C-alpha cells in the first residue's frame, strides 16, 4: 500500500499488518525463551 | 659515499652500520663497544692471516673474499679487499 | 696507528675497489635460510617482611621490566618489628625472596621507580617525608630524607613519581593536603617549586590519585578524596585546579589516562575508580563521565589501562577476584574475571611496561603474579578504530 | 653407509673430491691422490681448531658447525660438530 486512498486498501494494510504482527510475537517468543533459559543468575548487569 | 654504504649495510638483519677492520688490527670505523670489537678485530685478522697462508700453501694465485663463520647465536661476514677488511655481525636466519 | 691518518685515507680516493667488494658481498649476502586466558603466572611473598603489612602500591622500572617495587605500610604485629618496608621483586629468575630490601622508619605506602637514576628507589611515607633509598649502598635505611618543613609535605603523601627527559627530571609528589611539589633527583634538601592545590577560593583538595597524562607533563588530572576528579597544570598561569568534575559519590580510590599511543589519540580519556565500584571510562574533555560501569556488592581500589591495549584495563576488587574489561569486546561484562584463593582484599595493580603481565596487590602481603592470554593481550589494528567507534556510540 | 653417502654427496654437483675423515685430520682416504687429499685435510683441521678457537674466545660455550670458503679459484667446505670434518674441492661457482 502507497497513496493509495481506498479505506479498502487501509483495512488490507491492516490484515498486513496483523501479519507483521504475527512475525513480530514470534521475534517475542524467541527473544524471551532466550530470556529466561538465560536467567536465574542473579541480578547484576547482564544477568538481569 | 660513506653515508650511502653506512645506511645500506644497516638495512641487513642484525647490522649497525657498517665496521671496517685495518690490518693493524683495530677498526678503522667504530660502530660498537671499543675494546671487544679491537680484540676481536686482532684475532679475525690473525686468523685469515693464517687462512691466506693456508691457501697460499697449495693455491698461490688465489684472493680471499668469502668467509662464513656462523655459530648456533650469529654469523659473521669477514671480507677483506687488500686492507679494508669488512665485517658484519648478523643472524643466522 | 692513532685515528687521525684513518681519516685522510678514507678520505683518500682508492677506495672503488673497496665500495665493488663490499656492494658484492653484501649482494650475496642478501639471501639467509634456515639450517633445520587469565592464568596466576608467579608469586611473590616475604614472610620476614610481609607478616600482614597488606599492599600500597607498585611499580615497574622502564629501564629495567623485570624488576618491581612493593610497599607495605601497615605495622600491628609487632610495634618492634619494621614499620615500613619496600621490597623490590625482579622477573627474571624465580626466588623465594625479594632481591633486595628496604626500610624506613615511617610506614612506606607510597613507592615509584627512578628514571633518570637506574639504581635508585624513591618512595613516600606516612608521615609525608619523601623517602630515597640509593641501591648501589648496603644499607637499609634511606639515604636521602626530605625535611617535615611546611615547604614540604607534612601530611600522608600518594602520588609520588619522576618525569621529564633524561636531561629534564621533576619529582612531582602531592600529599593528601592537596600540595603539589617537584624536587630535583639529585637533590631533595629543599623543595625547588612547590604550590598547594585549591580550587574556588576557601575549598582545599583531599587530594588521593593522581595520573599524568602520555607525554604531556605540564598538565594533568587528580583524584579527590571527596569523589571528585579534577584536572590540575603542573606549571603555568593557571597552575591549579582546572575543572569541576561530579565524579561519584565515592572517593576515588585510583586515577589513570590513556596508556596507549600508535593510531587516533585517546589520551585526553582516563579511568577513575570511586569507592562504591564505578569505573568512568571518560574523557578530560567532556564533564560527564561517559561510562559507569556497576555490578558486585564490593568496590574497586585500582583501575590501569593497557600500555599497549587502547580498551583493555584492569581492575580490583575486595573479594579477591580480578576483571578486565576490553571494551571493543564489550561494555556490559568484565571480558576476563578470576578469584585469587583465600577471598582477600586486594589493594593495587600495575600493569607491566610491556602490557604482556599484570600485578597484583594483596591483604596479606602475598603478590600474584598474573599472565594474561595472548588474544586478549595484544591488541590489533583494527582494535583502535573499533575503540573509536565504541566511543562514537554514545 | 659409507659409499651412498660419497656418491651422494659428489654427485649432487659433479664435486671434484670428497672423503670422510671422522678422526682430527690426517685422513688415510683418497678421492684423487694421497697427499693432496691427506695433508691438506691436515692443514684444515689446524685452521679449523684455530677457528674454534676464535669463536670461543667471544664466548666460550660458542662452536662452529659450520664453515665455507669461496675464493676466487676454489671452494672449500668444512662443518665439524665434534670429530666430523667435512672435505670439498670445488670451483668458485
Redesign the interface.
Known amino acids: 500500500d502507497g497513496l493509495d486512498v481506498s479505506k479498502e486498501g487501509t483495512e488490507a494494510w491492516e490484515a498486513a499488518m496483523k501479519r507483521y504482527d504475527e512475525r513480530i510475537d514470534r521475534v517475542e517468543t524467541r527473544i524471551t525463551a532466550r530470556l529466561r533459559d538465560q536467567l536465574g543468575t542473579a541480578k547484576?548487569?547482564?544477568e538481569m | 659515499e660513506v653515508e650511502e654504504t653506512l645506511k645500506r649495510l644497516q638495512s641487513q638483519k642484525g647490522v649497525q652500520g657498517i665496521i671496517v677492520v685495518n690490518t693493524e688490527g683495530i677498526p678503522i670505523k667504530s660502530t660498537m663497544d671499543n675494546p671487544t670489537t679491537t680484540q676481536y678485530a686482532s684475532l679475525m685478522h690473525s686468523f685469515i692471516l693464517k687462512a691466506r697462508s693456508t691457501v697460499r700453501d697449495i693455491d698461490p694465485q688465489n684472493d680471499l673474499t668469502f668467509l662464513r663463520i656462523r655459530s648456533k647465536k650469529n654469523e659473521i661476514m669477514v671480507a677483506p679487499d687488500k686492507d679494508y677488511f669488512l665485517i658484519v655481525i648478523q643472524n643466522p636466519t | 696507528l692513532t685515528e687521525e691518518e684513518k681519516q685522510q685515507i678514507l678520505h683518500s680516493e682508492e677506495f672503488l675497489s673497496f665500495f665493488d667488494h663490499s656492494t658484492r658481498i653484501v649482494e650475496r649476502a642478501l639471501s639467509e635460510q634456515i639450517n633445520i586466558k587469565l592464568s596466576l603466572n608467579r608469586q611473590f611473598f616475604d614472610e620476614r617482611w610481609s607478616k600482614h603489612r597488606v599492599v600500597s602500591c607498585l611499580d615497574w622500572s622502564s629501564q629495567y621490566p623485570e624488576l618491581l617495587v612493593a610497599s607495605y605500610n601497615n605495622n600491628e604485629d609487632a610495634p618492634h618489628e619494621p614499620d615500613g618496608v619496600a621490597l623490590v621483586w625482579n622477573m627474571k629468575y624465580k626466588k623465594t625472596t625479594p632481591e633486595y630490601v628496604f626500610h624506613c622508619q615511617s610506614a612506606v605506602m607510597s613507592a615509584t621507580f627512578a628514571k633518570f637514576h637506574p639504581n635508585l628507589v624513591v618512595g613516600g611515607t606516612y608521615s609525608g617525608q619523601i623517602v630515597l633509598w640509593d641501591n648501589r649502598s648496603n644499607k637499609r635505611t634511606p639515604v636521602q630524607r626530605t625535611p617535615l618543613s611546611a615547604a614540604a609535605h607534612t601530611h600522608p603523601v600518594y602520588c609520588v613519581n619522576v618525569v621529564g627527559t633524561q636531561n629534564a627530571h621533576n619529582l612531582i609528589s602531592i600529599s593528601t593536603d592537596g600540595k603539589i611539589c617537584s624536587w630535583s633527583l639529585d637533590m631533595l634538601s629543599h623543595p625547588q617549586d612547590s604550590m598547594e592545590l585549591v580550587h574556588k577560593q576557601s575549598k582545599a583538595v583531599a587530594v588521593t590519585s593522581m595520573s599524568f597524562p602520555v607525554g604531556d607533563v605540564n598538565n594533568f588530572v587528580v583524584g579527590s578524596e571527596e569523589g571528585s576528579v579534577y584536572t590540575a597544570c603542573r606549571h603555568g598561569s593557571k597552575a591549579g585546579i582546572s575543572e569541576m568534575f561530579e565524579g561519584h559519590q565515592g572517593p576515588i580510590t585510583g586515577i589513570h589516562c590513556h596508556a596507549a599511543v600508535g593510531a587516533v589519540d585517546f589520551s585526553h580519556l582516563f579511568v577513575t575508580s570511586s569507592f562504591d565500584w564505578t569505573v568512568k571510562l571518560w574523557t578530560t574533555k567532556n564533564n560527564k563521565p561517559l561510562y559507569s560501569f556497576?555490578?558486585?556488592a564490593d568496590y574497586v581500589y585500582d583501575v590501569m589501562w593497557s600500555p599497549t591495549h587502547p580498551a583493555l584495563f584492569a581492575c580490583v576488587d575486595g573479594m579477591g577476584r580480578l576483571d578486565l574489561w576490553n571494551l571493543n569486546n564489550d561494555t556490559?561484562?568484565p571480558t576476563a574475571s578470576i578469584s585469587v584463593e583465600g577471598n582477600p582484599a586486594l589493594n593495587r595493580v600495575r600493569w607491566t611496561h610491556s602490557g604482556r603481565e599484570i600485578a597484583v596487590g594483596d591483604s596479606e602481603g602475598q603478590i600474584v603474579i598474573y599472565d594474561v592470554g595472548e588474544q586478549i593481550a595484544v591488541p590489533r589494528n583494527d582494535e583502535w578504530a573499533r575503540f573509536g567507534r565504541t566511543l562514537a556510540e554514545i
Open positions: 547484576n548487569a547482564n | 556497576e555490578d558486585n556490559e561484562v
